[PDB]
Swiss-Prot record, chain B:
Record PTM Phosphothreonine, positions in chain: T96
Inducing or repressing factors: Expressed late during infection in a Rev-dependent manner.
Superkingdom of source: Viruses
Chain sites annotated for binding Zn(2+): H108, C114, C133, H139
Effect of A151P: Increased processing between p17 and p7
Effect of Q146A: 90% loss of interaction with CUL5. Does not affect interaction with host ELOC
Record text on subunit structure and interactions: Homomultimer; in vitro and presumably in vivo. Interacts with viral RNA and Pr55Gag precursor; these interactions mediate Vif incorporation into the virion. Interacts with the viral reverse transcriptase. Forms cullin-5-RING E3 ubiquitin-protein ligase complex (ECS complex) by interacting with host CUL5, RBX2, elongin BC complex (ELOB and ELOC) and CBFB/CBF-beta. Within the ECS complex, Vif interacts directly with host CUL5, ELOC and APOBEC (APOBEC3F and APOBEC3G) substrates.
Mutagenesis / variant outcome for changing A151E: No effect on processing between p17 and p7
Name of the encoding gene: vif
Organism: Human immunodeficiency virus type 1 group M subtype B (isolate NY5) (HIV-1)
Interaction with host APOBEC3G: region residues: 40-44
Record note on what altering K160A does: 33% loss of viral infectivity
Protein name per the record: Virion infectivity factor
Curated annotation (Swiss-Prot), chain C:
Domain Ubiquitin-like: residue ranges: 1-66
UniProt source species: Homo sapiens
Keywords, alphabetical: Acetylation, Host-virus interaction, Nucleus, Phosphoprotein, Transcription, Transcription regulation, Ubl conjugation pathway
Role played: SIII, also known as elongin, is a general transcription elongation factor that increases the RNA polymerase II transcription elongation past template-encoded arresting sites. Subunit A is transcriptionally active and its transcription activity is strongly enhanced by binding to the dimeric complex of the SIII regulatory subunits B and C (elongin BC complex). Core component of multiple cullin-2 and cullin-5-RING E3 ubiquitin-protein ligase complexes (ECS complexes), which mediate the ubiquitination of target proteins. By binding to BC-box motifs it seems to link target recruitment subunits, like VHL and members of the SOCS box family, to Cullin/RBX1 modules that activate E2 ubiquitination enzymes. Component the von Hippel-Lindau ubiquitination complex CBC(VHL).
Modified residues (N-acetylmethionine): M1
Broad class of the protein's primary localization: nucleus
Phosphothreonine: residues bearing it: T81
Family classification: Belongs to the Elongin B family.
Keyword Oxidoreductase: no
Cellular-component GO terms for this entry: Cul2-RING ubiquitin ligase complex; Cul5-RING ubiquitin ligase complex; cytosol; elongin complex; nucleoplasm; VCB complex
Protein name: Elongin-B
Keyword Magnesium: no
UniProtKB/Swiss-Prot annotation, chain D:
Main location class: nucleus
Subcellular location per the Swiss-Prot or TrEMBL entry: Nucleus
Annotated organism of origin: Homo sapiens (Human)
An example molecular function term from Gene Ontology annotations: sequence-specific DNA binding
Gene field: CBFB
Assembly information from the UniProt record: Heterodimer with RUNX1, RUNX2 and RUNX3. Interacts with COPRS. Found in a complex with PRMT5 and RUNX1.
Name of the protein this chain belongs to: Core-binding factor subunit beta
UniProtKB/Swiss-Prot annotation, chain E:
Summary of the function given for this chain in its UniProt record: SIII, also known as elongin, is a general transcription elongation factor that increases the RNA polymerase II transcription elongation past template-encoded arresting sites. Subunit A is transcriptionally active and its transcription activity is strongly enhanced by binding to the dimeric complex of the SIII regulatory subunits B and C (elongin BC complex). Core component of multiple cullin-RING-based ECS (ElonginB/C-CUL2/5-SOCS-box protein) E3 ubiquitin-protein ligase complexes, which mediate the ubiquitination of target proteins. By binding to BC-box motifs it seems to link target recruitment subunits, like VHL and members of the SOCS box family, to Cullin/RBX1 modules that activate E2 ubiquitination enzymes. Component the von Hippel-Lindau ubiquitination complex CBC(VHL).
GO BP, sorted A to Z: protein ubiquitination; regulation of transcription by RNA polymerase II; target-directed miRNA degradation; transcription initiation at RNA polymerase II promoter; ubiquitin-dependent protein catabolic process
Similarity remark: Belongs to the SKP1 family.
Domain of life: Eukaryota
Tissue-specificity statement: Overexpressed in prostate cancer cell line PC-3 and breast cancer cell line SK-BR-3.
Protein's name in the database: Elongin-C
Lineage per the UniProt record: Eukaryota, Metazoa, Chordata, Craniata, Vertebrata
Predominant subcellular localization, coarse grouping: nucleus
Compartments where found: Nucleus
C-alpha cells in the first residue's frame, strides 16, 4: 500500500505529458486492493475509486485522448481486474429460481472497470487492426469463462462486451462461433453447472439473424446437434423464451428444415412433467403460424397423433392448451384442407372425453371442437358417426 | 328493444404484417432486451373469441393496450384483410381510442434512448454526443428546430431488426 | 391549394400565403398593405417571362407542388419608375 | 370548455378530418356468396344479436366494428322501411363524440357522419381529462435528466 | 401584423406576427420588454429558420403526410447555434 499522492487531474494537465499522466494512472490503478476485509485501506479505496470515476470521464470526453502507445496499458489495466479468480459457489445445491442471488465483493470498483471497458470498445476511433495484435484469441478464451459468474448484474454487462467484440473484430468471428458451439455442446451432456446460458442464448439470437442465404453445411448441423436436444435441459423454465425464438427465426430462413424440426421436436417429448408440456405445446403452436401448406402434407400423422394423446391427460392445463388449438385461424384453415386424414385420428378421442370429464369448462370447449367438425364434409362425419357408433356398437358388443 | 353493444375502431391488416409484428415485439422483448417491462398476452385470456393477442405497455401509472384480431370477414374468400388491430388507453375504468401517430409518441416517453440535456451544448464544442436517438418513428411531428438540426449532424443508427413501430402495423399500401 | 411566395430586392423579402385561384391582385394587395405605396407602380418577376395584372398561377403554370413550405417560389418586387433586377444572393459558407 | 376547441380543430386535425367529413360507407360481409345470399345473411345478422358488422370508408384502412355486448347505442330498422339506422357513442382522442349512420339493404351502402355529444362531458371525470391532456402535451426531446 | 427581422450579415426579412409567435425568444424580447436584431446570425441561417417558421405554422397541430424539411449536412452547425439561441 504505497502512498498514492493525488496526481493533477487531466483537466489541469496540458497537452504535453498527458499520456504519461494517463499511463501512470493506469499503472496506479493496476493494483489489487481487495475488498473482502470489512475495514481496511480506508483511504486507498476512494482515491482509486475517484481515479476510475475520473478515468471514465476522460475517455468519454475529448477525441484524441486514446493513442496507439496506450493500447498495451489499457489491456493490462482491464485484464488485471476482469480476469479474476471467480469465487467458489456458496452452495453447490444453490437454486437459481428459489435462492436469492449471490453478490460480489469488489462490485463497487468493478462497476467502473466494466464501464471503462464498455466506453472504450465504443470509442470513436478504436482502430481494430491495432487492437488485432493485442486483443488476440487468448483474450476471448478467458472472457467466456467469466459468464459462469453468479451475480446477475455482471452477466448483462458481460454480454454487451461479447457483442461489441464480435460486431467489430472481423478476425475472431470463426473462433467465437466455434467457441459458442463448443461451450454449448458441453451443456447438453455434462455436469452442466453453467448458469449464464440465458444470457449466452441472447447472443445466439443476433448471430443467426445474420446467417446469409442459402445455408451452409456448418450451419445446418447446428440445429439437429445442438439446439434441438437442448430442450432436454433440466432448467428449461428459464431459457425456453430465448430458445423458442432462435428455433423459429432459424426456421424462417430455410423452410425445408420444418420436417426435421417437427420430427426432432416430437422425439424428445416430455413424459412426466406437467409444466414442461405446457410450454412445449406453445413451441409447436408458434411453428404452425409460419408453416407452409405443402410442408403440412408430411407431418399430419406423427404431429397430430401426439395431440390426440395429450387431450386425454390427467392435468387440466395440458388439456386446456391443446383444446385451444381449434381456435386459431391458420390452424383451422390447414385442417380443413386435409380433413379426410386428420378426422379419423382425433374423433375417436374427442368423442370419448365429451361425457367422462368432471370439469364442465373443459367439456364446454370440447363441444365447440365437435361442432366445428360438423362445419366440414359432414358426410364423412355422418359416415364416421354412423360407422363410429357401430364401432361403439362394436364396443357395445364388447359390453355385451 | 335493440340489444346493447360496444363499438370499436379496428384497422384491417393482412397476416404478414401481423406475424412480422409478433416477431419484432418478441425479439425486442426477449433477445435484445430493450423493452423489458412490456407484457405480451396470448389469445386464451379474453372473453371475446376474436382477439388474437394483446400487448400491454406501462406508461408510468397508466398503460396502453394494442389488441390484434383474427379472422373477421374470413371464411372462404381470401386473407387480404383477415386480421384487425385496435389501440386503447385505460386509466381507472376510463378509456379512449388513440390514433397510431399519437400512440407511438406516447410509448417513446417512458422508453428507449434520446438526446440528454447536455447533448446540444456538447455538440457545440465537440465533446461527443451520448446517448443518441435510435427511434426515429417517435418524432413524426415537427418539434423544435434543435432536434431537426441535431438529427442531421448525427444520423441515427439502425437497430439490426427494425425497432417495433405502431405505425408500420397500421398502413394500407394496398389502396395507397 | 395555397402556395407560398418569395419577393427579393436589395435587402428586403416577404413571406406570405394566398389562395389557389388567386390571380395576381391578391398578392399585389398584400404588398400594397405592407409597403404603403400605390399599387400599379410595380412589376412582378419570374425568370424573364413578363407578369400581367390578370395572370393566374394555373395560367402561369405554377402549381401547389411547385411551392412548398420548404422552398417557396421566388418572384421579386419592384417599384423611381423602373429598376433593375437586384437579386443579391444570400451569404455563403466560409468553405 | 375545451370540447369546443376540439370540435373547432375539425379543419386542422387528421382524426376528425378523415372519418367525419361526409364519406361513403358500405357493409363488408362475406363478399363471396351471391348477392341474394349476402342480403339474407346481412339481414339475419341485423336482427340476431349474435354476429359481427363491418363498415368501410370505401377506400381507406379504417373500419367500424360492432361487437355484441356479451363478448345508448342501437341499430334501428323499422323506421323508414328499407333502411337501417346506426347510432354509436364513442370517446375519440379524449373527446366524447356520437356516431350516426344509415345503410340501405338493397345496395348495402349508405352514409355516415359524426357529431359532437353534449351533456356527456362533466359527469365522467375532470382528472382523467386533465391527465390525458398533460400526457399529450409532453415532448421527449431534451427532457431526460442525464 | 408583421415583425421586421434584420440579419447580422446585412439582410432584412419580415414575417407575420402570428408566424413569429411560435418562437419563445423573440416573443419574450418583444411581447412585454418594433425592431429586433439577431446579431452574429448569417443571412442564410436566418432565411432557413424563417422558412422553418412558415413550415411549422402550416403543418402544426395537423398530422398528415407532412414532408421532411431538408438541411444539407454542410449547413448544420450554424443552424444548430441559431436554434439554440432562438429556442
Amino acid at each position: 500500500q504505497a502512498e498514492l499522492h493525488p496526481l493533477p487531474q487531466l483537466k489541469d494537465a496540458t497537452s504535453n505529458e498527458q499520456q504519461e499522466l494517463f499511463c501512470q494512472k493506469l499503472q496506479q490503478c493496476c493494483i489489487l486492493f481487495d475488498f473482502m476485509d470489512s475495514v481496511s485501506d480506508l483511504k486507498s479505496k476512494e482515491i482509486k475509486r475517484a481515479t476510475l470515476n475520473e478515468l471514465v470521464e476522460y475517455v468519454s470526453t475529448n477525441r484524441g485522448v486514446i493513442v496507439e502507445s496506450a493500447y498495451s496499458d489499457i489491456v493490462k489495466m482491464i485484464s488485471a481486474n476482469i480476469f479474476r479468480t471467480l469465487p467458489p459457489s456458496d452452495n453447490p445445491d444453490f437454486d437459481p429460481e428459489e435462492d436469492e442471488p449471490t453478490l460480489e465483493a469488489s462490485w463497487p470498483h468493478i462497476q467502473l472497470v466494466y464501464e471503462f471497458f464498455l466506453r472504450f470498445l465504443e470509442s470513436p476511433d478504436f482502430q481494430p487492426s491495432i487492437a488485432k495484435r493485442y486483443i488476440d484469441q487468448k483474450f476471448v478464451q478467458q472472457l467466456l469463462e467469466l459468464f459462469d459468474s453468479e451475480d446477475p448484474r455482471e452477466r448483462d454487462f458481460l454480454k454487451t462486451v461479447l457483442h461489441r467484440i464480435y460486431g467489430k473484430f472481423l478476425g475472431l468471428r470463426a473462433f467465437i462461433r466455434k467457441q459458442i458451439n463448443n461451450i454449448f455442446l458441453r451443456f447438453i451432456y455434462e455436469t452442466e453447472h453453467f448458469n449464464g446460458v440465458a444470457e449466452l442464448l441472447e447472443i445466439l439470437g443476433s448471430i443467426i439473424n445474420g446467417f446469409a442465404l442459402p445455408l451452409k453445411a456448418e450451419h445446418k448441423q447446428f440445429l439437429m446437434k445442438v439446439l434441438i436436444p437442448m430442450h432436454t435441459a433440466k432448467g428449461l423454465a428459464l431459457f425456453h423464451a430465448q430458445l423458442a425464438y432462435c428455433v423459429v427465426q432459424f426456421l424462417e430462413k430455410d423452410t425445408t428444415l420444418t420436417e426435421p424440426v417437427i420430427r426432432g421436436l416430437l422425439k424428445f417429448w416430455p413424459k412426466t412433467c406437467s409444466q414442461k408440456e405446457v410450454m412445449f405445446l406453445g413451441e409447436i403452436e408458434e411453428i404452425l403460424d409460419v408453416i407452409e401448406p405443402t410442408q403440412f402434407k408430411k407431418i399430419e400423422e406423427p404431429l397430430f397423433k401426439q395431440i390426440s394423446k395429450c387431450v386425454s391427460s390427467s392435468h387440466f392445463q395440458v388439456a386446456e392448451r391443446a383444446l385451444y388449438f381449434w381456435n386459431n385461424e391458420y390452424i383451422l384453415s390447414l385442417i380443413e384442407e386435409n380433413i379426410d386424414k386428420i378426422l379419423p385420428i382425433m374423433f375417436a378421442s374427442l368423442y370419448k372425453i365429451s361425457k367422462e370429464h368432471w370439469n364442465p369448462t373443459i367439456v364446454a370447449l370440447v363441444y365447440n371442437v365437435l361442432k366445428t367438425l360438423m362445419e366440414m364434409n359432414g358426410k364423412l362425419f355422418d359416415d364416421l358417426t354412423s360407422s363410429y357408433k357401430a364401432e361403439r356398437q362394436r364396443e357395445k358388443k364388447k359390453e355385451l | 328493444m335493440e340489444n346493447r353493444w360496444q363499438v370499436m375502431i379496428v384497422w384491417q391488416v393482412d397476416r404478414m404484417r401481423i406475424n412480422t409484428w409478433k416477431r419484432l415485439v418478441k425479439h425486442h422483448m426477449y433477445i435484445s432486451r430493450k423493452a423489458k417491462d412490456w407484457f405480451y398476452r396470448h389469445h386464451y385470456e379474453s372473453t371475446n373469441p376474436k382477439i388474437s393477442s394483446e400487448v400491454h405497455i406501462p406508461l408510468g401509472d397508466a398503460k396502453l393496450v394494442i389488441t390484434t384480431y383474427w379472422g373477421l370477414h374470413t371464411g372462404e374468400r381470401d386473407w387480404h384483410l383477415g386480421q384487425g388491430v385496435s389501440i386503447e388507453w385505460r386509466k381507472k375504468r376510463y378509456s379512449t381510442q388513440v390514433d397510431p401517430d399519437l400512440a407511438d409518441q406516447l410509448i417513446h416517453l417512458h422508453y428507449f434512448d434520446c438526446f440528454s440535456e447536455s447533448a446540444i451544448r456538447n455538440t457545440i464544442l465537440g465533446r461527443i454526443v451520448s446517448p443518441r436517438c435510435e427511434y426515429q418513428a417517435g418524432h413524426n411531428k415537427v418539434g423544435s428546430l434543435q432536434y431537426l438540426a441535431l438529427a442531421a449532424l448525427i444520423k441515427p443508427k439502425q437497430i439490426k431488426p427494425p425497432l417495433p413501430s405502431v405505425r408500420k402495423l397500421t398502413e394500407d399500401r394496398w389502396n395507397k | 391549394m395555397d402556395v407560398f411566395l418569395m419577393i427579393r430586392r436589395h435587402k428586403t423579402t416577404i413571406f406570405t400565403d394566398a389562395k389557389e385561384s388567386s390571380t395576381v391582385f391578391e398578392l399585389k394587395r398584400i404588398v400594397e398593405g405592407i409597403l404603403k405605396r400605390p399599387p400599379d407602380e410595380q412589376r412582378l418577376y419570374k425568370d424573364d417571362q413578363l407578369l400581367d395584372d390578370g395572370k393566374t398561377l394555373g395560367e402561369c403554370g405554377f402549381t401547389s407542388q411547385t411551392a412548398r413550405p420548404q422552398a417557396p417560389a421566388t418572384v421579386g418586387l419592384a417599384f423611381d419608375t423602373f429598376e433593375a433586377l437586384c437579386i443579391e444572393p444570400f451569404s455563403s459558407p466560409p468553405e | 370548455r375545451v370540447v369546443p376547441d376540439q370540435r373547432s380543430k375539425f379543419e386542422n386535425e387528421e382524426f376528425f378530418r378523415k372519418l367525419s367529413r361526409e364519406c361513403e360507407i358500405k357493409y363488408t360481409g362475406f363478399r363471396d356468396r351471391p348477392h341474394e345470399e349476402r342480403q339474407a345473411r346481412f339481414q339475419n345478422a341485423c336482427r340476431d344479436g349474435r354476429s359481427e358488422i363491418a363498415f368501410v370508408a370505401t377506400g381507406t384502412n379504417l373500419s367500424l366494428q360492432f361487437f355484441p355486448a356479451s363478448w345508448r347505442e342501437y341499430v334501428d330498422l323499422e323506421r323508414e322501411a328499407g333502411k337501417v339506422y346506426l347510432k354509436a357513442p364513442m370517446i375519440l382522442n379524449g373527446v366524447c363524440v356520437i356516431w350516426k349512420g344509415w345503410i340501405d339493404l338493397q345496395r348495402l351502402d349508405g352514409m355516415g357522419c359524426l357529431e359532437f355529444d353534449e351533456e356527456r362531458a362533466q359527469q365522467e371525470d375532470a382528472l382523467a381529462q386533465q391527465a390525458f391532456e398533460e400526457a399529450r402535451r409532453r415532448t421527449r426531446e431534451f427532457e431526460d435528466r442525464d | 401584423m408583421y415583425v421586421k427581422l434584420i440579419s447580422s450579415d446585412g439582410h432584412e426579412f419580415i414575417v407575420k406576427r402570428e408566424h413569429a409567435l411560435t418562437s419563445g425568444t423573440i416573443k419574450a424580447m418583444l411581447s412585454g420588454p418594433n425592431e429586433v436584431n439577431f446579431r452574429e446570425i448569417p443571412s442564410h441561417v436566418l432565411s432557413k429558420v424563417c422558412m422553418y417558421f412558415t413550415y411549422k405554422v402550416r403543418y402544426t397541430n395537423s398530422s398528415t403526410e407532412i414532408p421532411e424539411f431538408p438541411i444539407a449536412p454542410e449547413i448544420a452547425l450554424e443552424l444548430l447555434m441559431a436554434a439554440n439561441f432562438l429556442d
